[PDB]
Amino acid sequence: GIEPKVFFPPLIIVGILCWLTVRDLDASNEVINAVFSYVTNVWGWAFEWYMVIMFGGWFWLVFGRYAKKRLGDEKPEFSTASWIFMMFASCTSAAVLFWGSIEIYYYISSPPFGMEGYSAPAKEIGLAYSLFHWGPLPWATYSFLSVAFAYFFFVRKMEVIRPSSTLVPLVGEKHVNGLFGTVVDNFYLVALILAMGTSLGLATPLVTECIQYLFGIPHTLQLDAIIISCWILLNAICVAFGLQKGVKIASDVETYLSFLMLGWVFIVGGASFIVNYFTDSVGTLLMYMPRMLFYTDPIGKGGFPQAWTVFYWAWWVIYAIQMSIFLARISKGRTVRELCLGMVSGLTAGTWLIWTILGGNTLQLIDQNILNIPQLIDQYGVPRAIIETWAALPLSTATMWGFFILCFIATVTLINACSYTLAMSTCRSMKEGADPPLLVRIGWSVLVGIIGIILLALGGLKPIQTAIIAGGCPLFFVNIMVTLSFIKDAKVHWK
Amino acid sequence: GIEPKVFFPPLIIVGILCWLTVRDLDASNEVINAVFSYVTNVWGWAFEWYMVIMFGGWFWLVFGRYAKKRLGDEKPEFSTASWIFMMFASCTSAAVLFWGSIEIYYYISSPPFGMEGYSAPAKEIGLAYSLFHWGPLPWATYSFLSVAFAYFFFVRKMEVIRPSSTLVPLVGEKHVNGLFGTVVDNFYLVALILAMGTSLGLATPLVTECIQYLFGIPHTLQLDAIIISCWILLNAICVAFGLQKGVKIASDVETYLSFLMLGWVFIVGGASFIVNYFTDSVGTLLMYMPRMLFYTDPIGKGGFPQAWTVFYWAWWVIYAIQMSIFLARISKGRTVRELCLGMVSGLTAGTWLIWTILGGNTLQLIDQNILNIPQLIDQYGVPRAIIETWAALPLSTATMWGFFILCFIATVTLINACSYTLAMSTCRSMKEGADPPLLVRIGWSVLVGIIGIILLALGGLKPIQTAIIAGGCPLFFVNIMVTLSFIKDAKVHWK
Amino acid sequence: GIEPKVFFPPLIIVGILCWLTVRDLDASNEVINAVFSYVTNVWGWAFEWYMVIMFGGWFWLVFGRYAKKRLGDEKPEFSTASWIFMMFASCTSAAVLFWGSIEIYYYISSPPFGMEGYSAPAKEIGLAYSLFHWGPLPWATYSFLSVAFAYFFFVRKMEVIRPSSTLVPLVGEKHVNGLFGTVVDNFYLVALILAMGTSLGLATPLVTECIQYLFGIPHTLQLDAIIISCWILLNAICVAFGLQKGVKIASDVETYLSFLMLGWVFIVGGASFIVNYFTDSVGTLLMYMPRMLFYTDPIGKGGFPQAWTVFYWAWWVIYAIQMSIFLARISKGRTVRELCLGMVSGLTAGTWLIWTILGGNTLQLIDQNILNIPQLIDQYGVPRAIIETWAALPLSTATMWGFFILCFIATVTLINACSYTLAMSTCRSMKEGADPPLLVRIGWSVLVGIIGIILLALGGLKPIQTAIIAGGCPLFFVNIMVTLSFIKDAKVHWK
Numbered sequence A, B, C: 001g002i003e004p005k006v007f008f009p010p011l012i013i014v015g016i017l018c019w020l021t022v023r024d025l026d027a028s029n030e031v032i033n034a035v036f037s038y039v040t041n042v043w044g045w046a047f048e049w050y051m052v053i054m055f056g057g058w059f060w061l062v063f064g065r066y067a068k069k070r071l072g073d074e075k076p077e078f079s080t081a082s083w084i085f086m087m088f089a090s091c092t093s094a095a096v097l098f099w100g101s102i103e104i105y106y107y108i109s110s111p112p113f114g115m116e117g118y119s120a121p122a123k124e125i126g127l128a129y130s131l132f133h134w135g136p137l138p139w140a141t142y143s144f145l146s147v148a149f150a151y152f153f154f155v156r157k158m159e160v161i162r163p164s165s166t167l168v169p170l171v172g173e174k175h176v177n178g179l180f181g182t183v184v185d186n187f188y189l190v191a192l193i194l195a196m197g198t199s200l201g202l203a204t205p206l207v208t209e210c211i212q213y214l215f216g217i218p219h220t221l222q223l224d225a226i227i228i229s230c231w232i233l234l235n236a237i238c239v240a241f242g243l244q245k246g247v248k249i250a251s252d253v254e255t256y257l258s259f260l261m262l263g264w265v266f267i268v269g270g271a272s273f274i275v276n277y278f279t280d281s282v283g284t285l286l287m288y289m290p291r292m293l294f295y296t297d298p299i300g301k302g303g304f305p306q307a308w309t310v311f312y313w314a315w316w317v318i319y320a321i322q323m324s325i326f327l328a329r330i331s332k333g334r335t336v337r338e339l340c341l342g343m344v345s346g347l348t349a350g351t352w353l354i355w356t357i358l359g360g361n362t363l364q365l366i367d368q369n370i371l372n373i374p375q376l377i378d379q380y381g382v383p384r385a386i387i388e389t390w391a392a393l394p395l396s397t398a399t400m401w402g403f404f405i406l407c408f409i410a411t412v413t414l415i416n417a418c419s420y421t422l423a424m425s426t427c428r429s430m431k432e433g434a435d436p437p438l439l440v441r442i443g444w445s446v447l448v449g450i451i452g453i454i455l456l457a458l459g460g461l462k463p464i465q466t467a468i469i470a471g472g473c474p475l476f477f478v479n480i481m482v483t484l485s486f487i488k489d490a491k492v493h494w495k
């Protein structure tokens, strides 16, 4: 049974946002590029203090009165080996192969700190910035929530699907099940939908360029509309006929494949450089870290932090509860100090590995003038430029297959987990473990695709960026509210 | 009853120092600018190691065997809210509005690290340096003494007026009440007198420029002599007729006003920039902090640390016992870890707030070419240039009133507290709580004014700088001696 | 009685390595300069991660479950005053006067970070780099082994001469006394021999230039062959006739002399600058430290870290067990936290003192154009250039004596301790405290001299550098293996 309380509002709005946008894709990019410019240039610092304060809680968790506190109070389900590996595995997606490949070009073209284009000082700081946006520092700002939920799930033995179920000890039962609790759940879902809808906007064009390389078929917006539909079908069949087995295997193979391609690119993409460059960019990270963390550039108005630093932070703000729930669900029976520790390590190892192998590889192709990225981007768009970095490797076809398969099924498990995440939080609380209403699952998977297409239809990265930054604005609060509950609540039932 | 032991010596010397100086104000500035150049350029590092070693004791206090040690051993007098606020309030003065306004111009004109004048790299480091000289780092070097006195006052239940009363457990009763104990008290008072006499040299010209703006009356040395005298009268009346009520209210209003003007300048002086710039200058601070802390420039001989970094340190060395006593008197019944913590935080919040609002505002006026600071300074002097930064705000007259009143009464409470601090430490130990000999109180307030006038008479900042750096030389030692007592003494009666 | 197990192999190889090298000193420098270029440019990072991971164990020792653990479990033999001083004294040698003098010139000529030659930014970072290569950071990476041995010697009460006697709890008794345990001991000795043979290559030319200055006799390779032989004789007489008394006195005088010459150069070599420069280079160190620690320069290919940073690390990797044994033997009855603490402090104070006095002095001579280092080096070689820095001081002859004597006997105690270190580890385990077989002691002292001569014969620093880097490759492992034993073993008999 559905919950009209949280079902109808987002479906209306997300329907409306499509309506106005799809009606005139010219005026949209005149406001898409106007909404983005506003938020980042005046509220960019808000995200950054958020990321430096949640960073404080990390040290407070590890070194506070809750450090040796054990959540759940029993033996863990997983061995540390499997447990760590499950985090290590969760770092594979479509958007990562996308960012892991091209992010270094944008750091090297128009660098931060007023450095010159393609300068050596810019190639120094190039990788080091990826290690910052995707390192132990944003992962640390997830620990407060992953501990929060693992606390609620296991210490307080409750069960939350929607975040409002956590705000009980700050606004009381009156507000929670009232209007206040629905305003946040309507927001959280809408912002979630955009965020997950953008993951498709990044995913499909990667998958289609692989297709264009292996099969020769022309990359068109009409083709992007196909694969998305085929993904809906693939998932619609998978849910209806149970098939929860096969999806898990595919998700397994995606992980084990991800290691092969990384190992591949690392092996033949100059292993000597990558190790050196990494080493050189770890020390460059640690030195400039407080500068990157508090960057706004108000005196030169370069636009770097606003472009990358705050937009990433908005991408991190969003998937907080989304991912912190996951980390909580698996960190059963552990103590909060060893959660935050094994988490940050195991995660960072996954993300650092990708950006250095893929990014350090991309740099070499720019360095050795093998490839002209600015030309490819102006002509065919971003995902083409990325695909050609993969193509500039020995055994291109086997490689492009290796990514094609990867970048494909990585989105299949993305859509399957998405429809689930929504339908559970969209319907009414049935018995836990049960599968969401088969039909409502489908509907969301289609509702996303429309957005994904539109985001592809508008063209460029700006719609993606603006969609997530927008969604990151309310979830800015929602995230703190969930933490403020734990902090308040744990002050009572833990000591 | 007076104490000729400590009364006569300083009165003689300070009388003499006026005599020689006021007799030929040309040769004075030939030695004023010669004494300054010597001390900073060869003993500048001495101050800095002092500030880095006392900084070490902070961490030793917080993380040492004295951390959870409680001084006084009872419930505190104040709630943390009031207690913190009392520190927050103590950051208002006349010299701060002076430095908070113009300090950034000197960092931006001739910057450190060999940077070019008015360069973007210089506007980056501009504010960040103020956050360093007036941040949690110099405040941390007060904690060792504030804990020392709060220890002596409350653990050892004694009562010190003069610092020599603390040196009992390192030189014994023979030296303390002998010649050694008087040499330091004669020094401590003389250096105190100069230091408090310089606070007037910074105060009056601010007050007079406000007068020149609102009333039109010409700023003259003859006018500076008036207000000072009127301040003596205002305080002479206030002490004689009790009036300890009204002074406390005025001191209250000064605080509550200080917030209004800051809030004002912050509201209409571009709140967007100030927040950004602050954020950008916090990260710039943390990154270059060990460089600023150990700066001497021996290879380029630029003269930056000597000019600002060591002169500020000398200003910090002086008011140590002066301020650490204050912090001790109020931190009653607290533990040394929570003193050092709430202190550094509450204080820094007060000082950081000022320098960023006032300094970040001043920069904008330079940036947008609204104002020409170097011209104003060459023509009318510093305090005029500062006044015009305030005048370049919407509702200038209401603003200039808001500062006029502020910058006025801030010096009234400064003179009232001064005469008290001296007369108590100048006379004999009466019953605690009693008011110092009514007449001797007046005499000191006049003895200061003569210096203040002379320091105004000599013109320029150099006499101020040289007067405090000179006073900071002996108090360099005196401060350590008081700490070495606590360290030695606490090793005995605490464990 | 000798141990043919570990006697014959190194004697064969080291004999062979002389054979091939001494047969054609032209082709040798074509491979000497080829082996060096390979290892550093591709395995340089291996050394650096080693130095950053062992650096991690330091903090793990101080803050881990072994922190308050006491090794030996009794009162220490030495008072802390003597104990610290014994570390302070151990920092005197011939190679240090060599590196302490000329190292700053190489940092100032062709600086790191792509800085320009003789730039002010290069004179800033000049000293700060010495404080890094010879500071608390490489000393911290010795603590894990010094605690390891002090653990084995005193907790496990065993006695190790050869490192293989420590690998008992990871490869079992089968491997230890088998082939595996001999492969490492053959390696450890060979690499030791080269490392100690290089200390002579640095020592003699210093001693001979002093001779050329005081006595006028021409510096020739034939003369270098003399002094070395005379050193063998001096030690051959010293061992045969007991004389363990006189050697200890000479070693005492060398220490007490070392302070005189440092104090001398510090007194008349501009004490004002040295204090300033030091202060300025401590803050420069702390700021760039993570950059220096993780430097590889893969994007500019300057060659700085490979030249200095990895070659020093290889010099540190080697003397680990050599020096960690020493520190262990004296740190009897102490707790591991107070070992690591007093060690790092007492040591660094010794090394920092030298490089700043000698290096900060050398810089001034370059700065004030008193001396032309590049000309002297091209013409007479390095040790001449160093000698002239000493000669550019007031009372040159008394100074050059002061170094001559120092730089002489410093090598006498170096050869005496060397033959002992080898012969003990070369022969069979007699009763501890006994003197090694009188004859085999001599033989090694000669075997070294041949290398030293050859290393002088090949000319330049490259043979020295290549000899130690080569020896540092296997001992890279050996060092970890000894630590992995302690870590494993202490997990059992300590908790």
Ligand SMILES: C[N+](C)(C)CCCC(=O)O
Binding pocket: A090, A091, A092, A093, A096, A315, A316, A319, A323
């Ligand atoms: C977790 N996040 C969103 C910060 C990056 C990982 C991407 C993914 O695994 O979906």
Ligand SMILES: C[N+](C)(C)CCCC(=O)O
Binding pocket: B090, B091, B092, B093, B096, B315, B316, B319, B323
């Ligand atoms: C405390 N101090 C002297 C470092 C700055 C505050 C100025 C004042 O409150 O009088």
Ligand SMILES: C[N+](C)(C)CCCC(=O)O
Binding pocket: C090, C091, C092, C093, C096, C315, C316, C319, C323
């Ligand atoms: C200990 N080490 C080899 C790193 C430097 C000291 C030189 C010496 O004392 O022989």
